[PDB]
Amino acid sequence: MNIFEMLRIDEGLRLKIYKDTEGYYTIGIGHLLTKSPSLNAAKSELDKAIGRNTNGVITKDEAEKLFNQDVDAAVRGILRNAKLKPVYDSLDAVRRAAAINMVFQMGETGVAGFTNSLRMLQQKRWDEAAVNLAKSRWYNQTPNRAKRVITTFRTGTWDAYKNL
Ligand SMILES: Fc1c(F)c(F)c(Cl)c(F)c1F
Numbered sequence: 001m002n003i004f005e006m007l008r009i010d011e012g013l014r015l016k017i018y019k020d021t022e023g024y025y026t027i028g029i030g031h032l033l034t035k036s037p038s039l040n041a042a043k044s045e046l047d048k049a050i051g052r053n054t055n056g057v058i059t060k061d062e063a064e065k066l067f068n069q070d071v072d073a074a075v076r077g078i079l080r081n082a083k084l085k086p087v088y089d090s091l092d093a094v095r096r097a098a099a100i101n102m103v104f105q106m107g108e109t110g111v112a113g114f115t116n117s118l119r120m121l122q123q124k125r126w127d128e129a130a131v132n133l134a135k136s137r138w139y140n141q142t143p144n145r146a147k148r149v150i151t152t153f154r155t156g157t158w159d160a161y162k163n164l
């Protein structure tokens with residue numbers, strides 16, 4: 001198990017434009033195209049991302065290319081964020097993956113409210129951190145995924161993703 005396999009489980013793989021859990025146009029392995037309700041806007045974003053006129057369909061190779069870029073962007077984003085970098089640096093590699101997973105899903109702006117969870121994680125108060133993390137819109141809207149990510153933070157193991 002690793003961050004790539006983990007997000008592959010959580011996000012799936014779809015080669016045609018679809019709507020994510022929030023209703024937003026997305027493609028591949030959870031690559032958000034746009035929050036715009038315009039399908040044409042989404043297709044434009046796709047073409048720009050891929051570098052060719054796609055009309056809404058990509059290959060597996062193309063999906064994986066965007067995925068690699070997105071994972072990279074999430075990591076580099078954490079490292080440039082003053083609120084996130086210290087907590088990330090303090091973690092082991094398994095829990096770092098859990099961190100990347102959250103940023104991938106909600107972005108740094110979607111994660112600004114997790115201040116208290118972040119403190120608890122830096123303190124390595126794993127059970128308390130896990131309880132605090134579940135007190136969120138995130139957990140309520142995507143409970144099964146949140147539960148997997150939270151279990152990863154709680155245990156520092158891949159147990160929530162084995163069998164998957
Ligand atoms: F390192 C971390 C992050 F970068 C992060 F965004 C969140 Cl929500 C975390 F919970 C965390 F531990």
Ligand SMILES: [Cl-]
Nearest residue numbers: 016017055056
């Ligand atoms: Cl389409």
